[PDB]
């Protein structure tokens, strides 16, 4: 038989291992010749595996690279101008790789050039609330200063935006062991911990969904008109560089001024963690100086697009996508994910050679330049927007398969909650102590839902990965899944060797998943979801699950507003219309489910599958959110304070944020009310797409 | 049998006459109690006629009305301040109506209040080129002056915008007999000509598709948040009033200054048509003074929405819509159209009571507040945007059925050219001398195509009527049709009694269409188009017809650019990518037609009908045109100089318009190139929706 169980049984742990090894021997940086060569390999093997067509789609986008003969580094300089201390030029390469070329040294992609000189201020994680504490409560002014911040808690792009608006003239980012160094485990190569010479690469853009900085709205094709650099989207205006904790100890050990305001400002190093500004008396005339010479340039990138045509609904698309570009070797991020995609293509191809086809079309993607701002996914979606919005059923992401070995992590649209629950009940747990039990049972036990007994935790989608254009711009139902670490004990700053040279095949095989059983479990979840979405006669979305979280989100935003009872009376601020819309959605969705359970008629079937497909689409507002035109979904956007986190009713949340500080309360509460109107209308319009059509 | 011929044969001239008489006995001004009463009548009769459901949809929108106890008028004042001349307070009412109440006096809807005083300048039709001639060639400065302009050639809203930007402090509009008074025909009530006391009402907004000035983007429902007046869309900033040619002769007869620059500036009255500024020497200290006291206020309006459910594709919508509100009696505009809609509903209802249903759903609409800015259609479409864009097949408009008695006028999307040609070949000509001939033959003979021998003229859609939100905002295929006057001899300023008290039932029955045979022909065209669109198994759109006009539009915009050969060399301005896209569209559309002619399979059928439905939709750009976010179609927009006229490749046209006057040629030619990029990309993306889907 050709059913889901045939599909699932053909996947093998041993194939995923082989592919991960094949993908991680050399660096595959976006825009380099070796990442083009890997794209041509993937295209050739996806055709051999059986897909009906496989093509490269290329784009010419803005990337960023260091200057090979003019290295980036930081100094302490004395009164006379001698550089008495210099940060490293490279990470000590790991055992066996000490002769590999083309390892890009640590840098912050898209930093402007400069050589600023001045006094240090320590700003903790550089969050919005950390700058409020500095300027409002401690009275410390960052204008004209170089800020040093530890990585962790929020996207590094938001840290840089926050430092810029406080008037900083440069930023220094470092990894503190309190966040990235765990209890009793050794540094690479003896364990999975971060060494004092290790450094986290990463871009520092604020794109808010735009894609290529030079071509917002349109694909970066051969005849594209480009903005000049000064009008480009999302570039930072001050120099930025990342360092390891050996180098950071040298820069912090001399800091004077105010004490840390409390113990949540202290890391793990043997230093006071004083806030500054400047150094203590003996070294009060010393200074910090940055040297940054990176350049921005328009470089070609390549997506691989494979197609497996549907037998019945060839004009309905189910997409499995993940990126292929890496900062260095990509042992976890992304090749642990791309190796799983490779095995999933191979199994669907096995079925196809025996004569099977799915009901709906499945599209497979190897994205480029994800690490430089989701550029490959976003340019392809800009090019194909009209097809994706009238034909796109769902998008399943496939970056890193593991960031731990404790239990499953799922973030998705409410429309897939029921699909995920049913599929994980039919899968075996790979966890020790759950031999012979379901993945549902082990996940539910190790990661309980906050709200409901006997259910597992499923989070909201945030951003910082390739689903952003499909979900928050186009309104296609999306999901992602991987193995992760324990929720208690989790500091939410990532795995220690994230975006480092130490992130290798050996990291994975020795310390994360020696048997490749977690990789295999994640391949069954991602591939099982794609199989049901593309083969089930009725789309596997449950509209009632949207109705439950919308009531939760409305209670939450109402409670934020109720902290200001006098202003709600003065300006006549009512949430009545939002709760009314949510009630109507609950009722109409309940009636829709009853009709979906009663009906031999394919037209009623296409009609009702189309109501299910366009329900996510219904939450899109073509005018976008305020000042963020490419974030169009009214229920979900990336937090304005942290691109990695999801925010619910983001229009209303942002109109309410820090409202008590605004100068014209009347105008600020007018905008709250406008955002309440937009959200009520949009929820009611979404509900009406599920009424009888005529 | 229940086929198109049964439908067409059930329509009767005598029914249309009766309904026109019923709709034109009293005024039906938007927002008044009598227009609400007519809406309740229409709803009740559409249910009796057989429709499955009929509902009122109401909205609270900004309208404008004069002050009953504080009349608008204009004066000539002397040195001492005595008003030596006063314009009329009302039009002399016609025979038999001299006791009807609630006739709104002449006014310009949405004029601000004021009483400005100053010297007159005559500006011809107040077009863009007339202000260029005044300021650039004649050196006459309109700053601080009251301008007087004749109606005709362009939408009165564009005239007011042009006067404002020249610095005028008020505007006076009048009807000149050279435009609105024809050869050897008598004034009402003895003929169809305009009397010297007649005046044209009309709004003077510049909405650019927004709808209700207070709620751009969202419906004006019960909980809507409203902008304050100062942030409202499209309101004029100087007082404006309309007058008849007796009053205009008094204001022009004393004008001094420069002579008219040529005979195209002279009308028909016995005056010099001097441009000013001010009066000749004897009366040089006299002045003109306006008195305007109209008020803007939020008023409820009511659309009637009738539904006839489809038997096979109930989730596909074919819409027949036209307005019901009138300035006074609405003898032509709009009730000559609404009476035709009434008879079309009655005939479809006859078939339905004998057991028939159309294949697709048909929606019938009686719009409100069209005369105040397309407000009823636009608010309903804003409310129902998600349903209309995923389910809307086509929209057929139904305002005035006659503006003449010479031949047919059709303006529509290229996708309906073939449908119109085939339907008119099956219809009888009502023209004298074409007894026993087809409507196609008489139309083709009296109104030949400019391009192709043996074909009739079909124009581009412009704007100034209720199709604007469906076509240029949402991208639903649209069309309109009516009887009109002879193309040569046509001055393009409208029928003489347009928006006047003299526009009555008697006007129509005595001078336009005594037998109601032109009304009947127009009902067969509008109703035949709706019948084919809603019942034909394959949608009746031909994509190849889009491919032919796109090449024509590309040749046209290229020729405008080639007037500047040195600048095209300096800035490397190429149209190669646009011609490449148009070539690709021609080829892909040709292959699509071949597939459409070969295929018992309903899924292939739904798939291919969906490619035909979404092809118009494919020309929509979600970011809109520059500064006009609600004009989203990249091929067609209303002219920026004349809302009534259509412009092709409007992004490029406007970047090129008057480019030789721009201060920074480099920036101006950069924007031309950007607009070439957007148009090529959009044409190619549209073509790709017609490729095989997988
Ligand atoms: C959720 O669904 C329900 C449908 O079950 C929907 O109910 C609607 O609520 C509005 C109230 O905002 C109703 O509007 C009324 O319509 C009548 C005519 O049918 C009008 O006469 C009413 O106007 C008068 O009263 C107002 C209120 O005091 C005055 O301000 C106004 O000036 C008038 O004097 C009023 O407009 C509507 O009829 C119901 N529809 C029903 C019951 O079918 C509700 O709106 C939905 N929620 C959302 C957020 O959409
Ligand atoms: C209309 O349809 C045709 C399809 O039949 C489509 O043709 C495409 O044109 C572009 C040219 O803009 C081709 O792009 C090339 O792709 C190859 C790889 O396949 C590249 O190597 C080429 O790049 C090199 O050469 C460039 C030109 O000098 C250099 O600037 C560049 O730096 C490289 O050195 C080039 O990008 C594309 O392959 C064809 N596709 C085909 C034939 O399948 C055409 O674009 C369509 N028109 C529009 C407006 O879309
Ligand atoms: O340009 C961009 O938008 C992103 C490009 C690139 N993307 C990327 O590296 N993404 C990784 C890592 C995303 C960050 C992350 O996984 N964590 C791990 C913790 N997980 C969560 O915070 C988390 C967030 C939302 C959610 F619903 N569940 C868990 C994290 C958080 C804060 C700081 C540092 C790392 C991924 O999605 O796997 C980058 O972030 O530099
Ligand atoms: O607010 C709005 O947008 C419009 C509200 C109202 N709409 C209205 O009255 N529309 C009428 C009249 C439209 C104007 C018109 O028909 N002509 C008659 C000449 N016809 C054309 O110009 C024409 C335009 C385009 C085309 F493709 N074919 C003929 C005209 C033109 C210029 C000045 C005065 C009148 C209609 O569409 O039947 C108004 O214009 O005040
Ligand atoms: C990764 O696997 C690929 C595919 O097996 C290897 O590429 C093949 O290499 C052999 C020997 O050089 C050639 O005969 C084929 O032409 C290649 N196939 C392709 C490109 O599809 C590749 O060498 C492996 N890489 C590593 C680092 O082991
Ligand atoms: C997940 O599984 C449940 C339980 O099997 C499915 O719910 C059942 O669906 C059948 C078929 O329509 C109904 O007759 C039952 O009454 C349902 N049981 C319930 C709601 O308790 C559910 O549909 C599945 N979810 C999917 C496929 O998305
Ligand atoms: C226009 O036609 C309508 C419908 O025939 C007339 O309205 C009806 O009037 C009669 C007599 O007053 C009543 O019995 C009905 O209740 C009305 N029907 C409705 C409102 O649907 C109306 O009087 C006619 N108007 C004119 C001006 O002749
Ligand atoms: C208008 O009428 C023409 C002529 O009847 C239609 O074109 C024919 O359509 C049939 C059925 O598909 C073809 O087999 C013929 O070859 C066509 N003749 C041609 C193209 O010369 C045309 O389709 C009609 N237009 C519509 C329905 O929109
Ligand atoms: C790299 O640095 C050198 C200076 O040592 C400079 O001349 C060269 O142009 C730089 N490369 C760039 C900017 O690409
Ligand atoms: C740091 O580098 C600079 C430039 O190469 C050099 O002049 C200086 O001596 C170095 N300082 C130390 C302490 O090594
Ligand atoms: C911070 O310092 C600079 C002056 O060097 C000044 O422009 C800014 O206003 C200061 N802000 C304060 C003191 O709040
Ligand atoms: C893998 O599993 C073991 C078993 O608990 C755990 O102690 C170890 O830390 C895990 N490895 C990683 C990288 O978390
Ligand atoms: C109409 O005019 C009178 C003045 O004669 C004024 O008092 C009244 O308020 C006006 N009505 C309005 C502005 O609605
Ligand atoms: C015009 O009207 C005003 C105000 O009613 C009046 O004072 C004046 O006499 C009138 N002028 C003439 C010439 O009738
Ligand atoms: C028109 O007149 C006014 C002065 O009253 C002036 O502001 C404007 O610049 C003038 N324009 C000219 C003379 O071009
Ligand atoms: C109606 O038709 C006659 C016949 O040519 C024509 O002379 C007359 O002017 C027409 N009426 C109107 C209003 O155009
Ligand atoms: Ca782009
Ligand atoms: Ca509105
Ligand atoms: Cl992922
Ligand atoms: Cl019309
Ligand atoms: Zn990644
Ligand atoms: Zn990454
Ligand atoms: Zn009208
Ligand atoms: Zn009108």
Both tokens of A256, joined, read: 């004077």
Decide: helix, strand or coil at residue A229: helix
Give the ranges where A185-321 is alpha helix by DSSP (H): 245-252
H-helix segments, B321-403: 335-353, 375-383, 385-391
* Ligand 9 proximity of A82 Cβ (cutoff 6 Å): no
CA of B453 to the centre of ligand 20 (A): 27
Q: Crossing angle, helix A576-597 and helix A543-561, to 10 degrees?
A: 170
Ligand 16 within 6 A of CB of B510: no
Under DSSP, the state recorded for A263 is G
Q: In the structure encoding, which two tokens stand for residue A224, read together?
A: 């594209």
Evaluate whether A219 touches B677 at the Cβ level (below 8 Å).
no
A59 strand-pairing partners: A301
Resolution for this PDB entry, in angstroms: 2.1
Pick from B448, B415, B480, B320: nearest CA to B612: B415
Is A644 annotated in some ligand binding site?
yes
Q: Determine the Cα–Cα distance for residues B173 and B351; give it in Å rounded to an integer.
A: 49
**Ligand index nearest the alpha carbon of residue B644:** 4
> Phi and psi dihedrals of A397, rounded to 5?
-80, 160
Distance from CA of B419 to the nearest CA of A (A): 26
CA dist., res. B475 & res. B644, Å (int): 18
Distance from chain centroid for Cα A635: 18
Question: Which residue is listed with tokens 């139902």?
Answer: A477
What is the CB < 6 Å shell around ligand 3?
Answer: A 152, 202-203, 371, 373-374, 399-400, 411, 459-460, 462, 464-465, 492-494, 643-646
Torsion of CA B344, B348, B349, B354, to 10 degrees: 150
* Ligand (nearest to CA of A138): 11
Alpha carbon distances (Å) from B518 to B190, B202, B423, B430, B499: 22, 27, 16, 7, 21
Is B225 in Cβ contact with A607 (below 8 Å)?
Answer: no
* Distance, CA of B78 to CA of B285 (rounded, Å): 7
- B615-B618-B622 Cα angle (round to 5): 155
Is A119 annotated to bind a ligand? Reply is no
**Which residue, B206, B376, B220, is CA-closest to B298?**
B220
Distance CA A35, CA A672 (A): 47
Distance of CA A55 to the CA centre of its chain: 26
> Is A378 annotated for ligand binding?
no
Q: How far is CA B350 from the centre of its chain?
A: 32
Task: Give the C-alpha separation, A155 to A127, whole Å.
Answer: 9
Residue B677's closest CA among A221, A469, A302, A299? A221
Q: Which helix (H) or strand (E) holds B55?
A: strand B53-65
Contact (Cβ atoms closer than 8 angstroms) between residue B23 and residue B330:
yes
Supply the residue whose CA is at minimum distance from atom 27 of ligand 1: B222
Tell me the two tokens of residue B311. Answer: 């038997």
Which atom of ligand 9 is found nearest the CA of A68?
1
Residues 6+ apart with CB under 8 A from A230: none
Ligand 5 atom 2, closest CA: A22
Distance CA B445, CA B556 (A): 27
Pairing of strands B117-118, B287-291: antiparallel
Q: How far is A81 from chain B (nearest CA, A)?
A: 45
Query: B385 with B320: CB under 8 angstroms?
Result: no
Here the tokens at position A388 are: 């994706």
Q: Is A430 helix (H, G, I), strand (E, B) or coil?
A: coil
Query: Cβ A313–B225 below 8 Å, yes or no?
Result: no
Hey, is the C-beta of A14 within 8 angstroms of any chain B C-beta? no
Shortest CA distance to B494 belongs to which of B18, B128, B51, B152?
A: B152
The single residue listed with the structure tokens 């952003």 is A468
The rounded radius of gyration (Å) of the Cα atoms in chain A is 26
Distance of CA A274 to the CA centre of its chain: 32
- CATH 3.40.50.300 holds for B1-66+293-540: no
C-alpha distance from residue A180 to each of A199, A383, B354, B464 (Å): 11, 39, 78, 64
- Statement: B67-292 belongs to CATH 3.30.70.3040: no
B370 catalytic? Reply is: yes
Q: Which residues lie across from A10 on neighbouring strands?
A: none
Say yes or no: A684 contacts chain B, CB-CB below 8 A.
Answer: no
Gap between the Cα atoms of A235 and A326, Å rounded = 21
Q: CB of B680 within 8 Å of any CB in chain A? A: yes
Reduced to 3 states, what is the DSSP secondary structure of residue A633?
Answer: strand
Using CA positions, which residue lies closest to atom 13 of ligand 6? A597
A151 is in an annotated binding site: no
Atom 25 (ligand 3): residue with closest C-alpha?
A645
DSSP conformational letter for B372 = G
User: Chain centroid to CA B361: how far?
Assistant: 26
Distance B222 CA to ligand 1 centre (A): 7
CA distance B562 to chain A (A): 20
Distance A604 CA to ligand 6 centre (A): 19
How far CA A663 is from CA of A660, A681, B188, in Å, comes to 8, 29, 63
Cα separation, B206 vs B159, in Å, equals 10
Does an H or E element contain A484, and which?
A: strand A477-484
A594 is catalytic: no
Q: Which residues pair with A317 in a beta bridge?
A: A361, A392
CA A578 to ligand 1: nearest atom: 49
Residue tagged 């109703």 (tokens): B527
Q: What 3-state DSSP class applies to B605?
A: helix
> Which numeric CATH code is attached to B541-694?
1.20.930.40
Rounded-to-integer distance, Cα A337 and Cα A325, Å? 12
Contacts of B372 (CB under 8 A, 6+ apart): B30, B61, B63, B64, B109, B110, B203, B325
Q: Is-catalytic flag, B58?
A: no
- Tell me if residue A616 is catalytic: no
Asked whether B480 and B410 are in contact (CB, 8 A), the reply is: yes
The span from the CA of B537 to the CA of B639, in Å, is 36
Bind-site residues of B: 156, 203, 215, 218, 323, 333, 370-371, 379, 382, 399, 463-465, 480-482, 498-499, 643-644
Q: Is A231 annotated as a binding residue?
A: no
Nearest CB among B391, B607, B677 relative to A224 is that of: B677
How far is Cα B516 from Cα B497, in angstroms, rounded to an integer? 19
Q: Which residues of B154-173 are buried (b: 16+ CB within 10 A; e: fewer)?
A: bbbbbbbbbbbebebbbbbb
| DSSP classification of residue B487 | T
Q: Which of residues 218-237 of B touch A (CB under 8 A)?
A: 218-219, 221, 223-225
Instruction: Say if residues A666 and A565 touch (Cβ distance below 8 Å).
Output: no
Compute CA B663 distance to the chain's CA centroid, rounded to the nearest angstrom.
Answer: 35
Element (DSSP H or E) covering residue B635:
none
**Structure tokens, B107:** 């006014």
Q: What are the distances in angstroms from CA B690 to CA A287, B223, B608?
A: 64, 42, 9
Cβ neighbours, 10 Å, residue B401: 33
Structure solved using which method?
Answer: X-ray
Ligand 24 centroid from CA B405, angstroms = 19
- Cα–Cα separations (whole angstroms), residue B297 to A42, A418, B553: 65, 50, 43
Instruction: Find, among A50, A694, A56, the residue nearest to A368 by Cα.
Output: A56
Report how far apart, in Å, the C-alpha atoms of A344 and of each of A28, A338, A362, B452 are: 22, 10, 12, 57
Q: Of B215, B315, B393, which to mutate for an interface test with A (greatest number of A Cβ within 10 Å)?
A: B315
Contact in structure between B379 and B62 (CB atoms under 8 Å)? no
State the Cα–Cα distance between residues B333 and B325, nearest whole angstrom: 9
Compute the distance between CA of residue B99 and CA of residue B96 in angstroms, rounded to an integer. 8
Q: Which two tokens stand for residue A436?
A: 């012979």
Pairing of strands A642-648, A636-639: antiparallel
* Angle, CA of A258, A264 and A267, to the nearest 5°: 85
**CA A387, CA A305: separation in Å to the nearest integer?**
15
Distance CA B446, CA B404 (A): 13
Question: A693 vs B315: CB contact, 8 Å cut-off?
Answer: yes
User: Of the candidates B453, B637, B614, which has an alpha carbon nearest to the alpha carbon of residue B541?
Assistant: B614
Q: How far apart are CA B281 and CA B152, in angstroms?
A: 31
Q: Look at strands B477-484 and B407-412 and give their pairing.
A: antiparallel
Residue A655, CB half-sphere, CA atoms under 13 Å: how many? Answer: 26
Helix (H, G, I), strand (E, B) or coil at B515: coil
The CB density around residue A692, as the number of other CB atoms within 10 Å, is 12
DSSP bridge pairs for B303: B57
B322/B334 Cα distance (integer angstroms):
8
Residue boundaries of the structural domains of chain A: 1-66+293-540, 67-292, 541-694
């Amino acid at each position: 038989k050709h059913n889901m169980k045939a599909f699932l049984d053909e996947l093998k742990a041993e194939n995923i291992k082989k592919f991960l090894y094949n993908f991680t021997q050399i660096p595959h940086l976006a825009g380099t010749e070796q990442n083009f060569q890997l794209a041509k390999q993937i295209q050739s093997q996806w055709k051999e595996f059986g897909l009906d067509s496989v093509e490269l789609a290329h784009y010419d986008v803005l990337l960023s690279y260091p200057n090979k003969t003019h290295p980036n580094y930081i100094s302490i300089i004395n009164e006379d101008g001698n550089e008495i201390f210099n940060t490293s030029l490279f990470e000590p390469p790991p055992p066996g790789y000490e002769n590999v070329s083309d390892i890009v040294p640590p840098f912050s992609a898209f930093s402007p050039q400069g050589m600023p000189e001045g006094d240090l201020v320590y700003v903790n994680y550089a969050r919005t609330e950390d700058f409020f504490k500095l300027e409002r409560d401690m009275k410390i002014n960052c204008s004209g200063k170089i800020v040093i911040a530890r990585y962790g808690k929020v996207f590094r792009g938001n840290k840089v935006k926050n430092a810029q608006l406080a008037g900083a003239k440069g930023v220094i980012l470092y990894s503190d062991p309190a966040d990235y160094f765990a209890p009793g485990v050794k540094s690479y190569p003896d364990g999975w911990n971060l060494p004092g010479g290790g450094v986290q690469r990463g871009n520092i853009l604020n794109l808010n969904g735009a894609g290529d900085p030079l071509t917002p709205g349109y694909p970066a094709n051969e005849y594209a008109y480009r903005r000049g650099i000064a009008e480009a989207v999302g570039l930072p205006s001050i120099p930025v560089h990342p360092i390891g904790y050996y180098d950071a100890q040298k820069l912090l050990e001399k800091m004077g001024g105010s004490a840390p305001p409390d113990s949540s400002w202290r890391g793990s190093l043997k230093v006071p963690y004083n806030v500054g500004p400047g150094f203590t008396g003996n070294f009060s005339t010393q200074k910090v100086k940055m040297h940054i010479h990176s350049t921005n340039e328009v470089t070609r990138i390549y997506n691989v697009i494979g197609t497996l045509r549907g037998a019945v609904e060839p004009d309905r698309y189910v997409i499995l996508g993940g990126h292929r570009d890496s900062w260095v070797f990509g042992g976890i991020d992304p090749q642990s994910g791309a190796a799983v995609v490779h095995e999933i293509v191979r199994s669907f191809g096995t079925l196809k050679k025996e004569g099977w086809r799915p009901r709906r079309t499945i599209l497979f993607a190897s994205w480029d330049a994800e690490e430089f701002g989701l550029l490959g996914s976003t340019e392809w979606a800009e090019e194909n927007s009209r097809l994706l919005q009238e034909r796109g059923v769902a998008y399943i992401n496939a970056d890193s398969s593991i960031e731990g070995n404790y239990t499953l992590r799922v973030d998705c649209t409410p429309l897939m909650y029921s699909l995920v629950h049913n599929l994980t009940k039919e899968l075996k747990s790979p966890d020790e102590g759950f031999e012979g039990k379901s993945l549902y049972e082990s996940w539910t036990k190790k990661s309980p839902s906050p709200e409901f007994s006997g259910m597992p935790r499923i989070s909201k989608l945030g951003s910082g990965n390739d689903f952003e254009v499909f979900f928050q711009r186009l309104g296609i139902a999306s999901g992602r899944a991987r193995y992760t670490k324990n929720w208690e004990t989790n500091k939410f700053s990532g795995y220690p060797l994230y975006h480092s040279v130490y992130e290798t095949y050996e990291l994975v095989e020795k310390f994360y998943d020696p048997m490749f059983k977690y990789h295999l479990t994640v391949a069954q979840v991602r591939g099982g979801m794609v199989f049901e979405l593309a083969n089930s006669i009725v789309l596997p979305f449950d509209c009632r699950d949207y109705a439950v979280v919308l009531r939760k989100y409305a209670d939450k935003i109402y409670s934020i507003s109720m902290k200001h009872p006098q202003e709600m009376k003065t300006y006549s601020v009512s949430f009545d219309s939002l709760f009314s819309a949510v009630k109507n959605f609950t009722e109409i969705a309940s009636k829709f489910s009853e009709r979906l359970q009663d009906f031999s008629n394919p037209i009623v079937l296409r009609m009702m599958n189309d109501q299910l497909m366009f329900l996510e689409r219904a939450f899109i507002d073509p005018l976008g959110l305020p000042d963020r035109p490419f974030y169009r979904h009214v229920i979900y956007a990336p937090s304005s304070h942290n691109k990695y986190a999801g925010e619910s009713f983001p229009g209303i949340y942002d109109a309410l944020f820090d409202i008590e500080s605004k100068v014209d309360p009347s105008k600020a509460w007018g905008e709250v009310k406008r955002q309440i109107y937009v959200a009520a209308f949009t929820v009611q319009a979404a509900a009406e797409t599920l009424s009888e059509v005529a």
